[PDB]
UniProtKB/Swiss-Prot annotation, chains A, B:
<comment type="pathway">
    <text>Lipid metabolism; fatty acid biosynthesis.</text>
</comment>
<dbReference type="InterPro" id="IPR006162">
    <property type="entry name" value="Ppantetheine_attach_site"/>
</dbReference>
<dbReference type="GO" id="GO:0005829">
    <property type="term" value="C:cytosol"/>
</dbReference>
<comment type="similarity">
    <text>Belongs to the acyl carrier protein (ACP) family.</text>
</comment>
<comment type="function">
    <text>Carrier of the growing fatty acid chain in fatty acid biosynthesis.</text>
</comment>
<dbReference type="GO" id="GO:0000036">
    <property type="term" value="F:acyl carrier activity"/>
</dbReference>
<dbReference type="GO" id="GO:0000035">
    <property type="term" value="F:acyl binding"/>
</dbReference>
<feature type="modified residue" description="O-(pantetheine 4'-phosphoryl)serine">
    <location>
        <position position="37"/>
    </location>
</feature>
<protein>
    <recommendedName>
        <fullName>Acyl carrier protein</fullName>
    </recommendedName>
</protein>
<keyword id="KW-0596">Phosphopantetheine</keyword>
<keyword id="KW-0444">Lipid biosynthesis</keyword>
<dbReference type="GO" id="GO:0016020">
    <property type="term" value="C:membrane"/>
</dbReference>
<feature type="domain" description="Carrier">
    <location>
        <begin position="2"/>
        <end position="76"/>
    </location>
</feature>
<keyword id="KW-0276">Fatty acid metabolism</keyword>
<dbReference type="InterPro" id="IPR003231">
    <property type="entry name" value="ACP"/>
</dbReference>
<keyword id="KW-0443">Lipid metabolism</keyword>
<keyword id="KW-0597">Phosphoprotein</keyword>
Length: 76, 76
């Protein structure tokens, strides 16, 4: 769904201050979008709450890229 | 962008007759969405035209999944 990706993208733009055009699926939060580790924890917390789901420690660590985040949401 | 994924998803639904809920990024056209090889060529042709872009033989062959298709679009 497009609504899911709009919601994910809105949050990344809110937190990381990047252009929407830079929020591609392959973009990694740290290497491409300027997030550091505190930011990334914060993003995941925020995504969890937006989609009313709990992500485990083990699964959250696999989330390097925008696409990784959407994949997890889409599998719940 | 959400508009890009809405456009990709509309086409897959049109051609393959699957529910929107089944059009996840990790879903492969052949193994998950019931497309055969003729369908896949047809999808790519259709996506090319929707986004006014030409995909090479070499790149189109790497497109197994919905996410693979969106990635290519997003990199052009
Ligand atoms: Pt969805
Ligand atoms: Pt991906
Ligand atoms: Pt886009
Ligand atoms: Pt992917």
């Amino acid at each position: 769904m497009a609504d899911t990706l709009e919601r994910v993208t809105k949050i990344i733009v809110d937190r990381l201050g990047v252009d929407e055009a830079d929020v591609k699926l392959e973009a990694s939060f740290k290497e491409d979008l300027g997030a550091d580790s505190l930011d990334v924890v914060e993003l995941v917390m925020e995504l969890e709450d937006e989609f009313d789901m709990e992500i485990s420690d083990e699964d959250a660590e696999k989330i390097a890229t925008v696409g990784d985040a959407v994949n997890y949401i889409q599998n719940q």
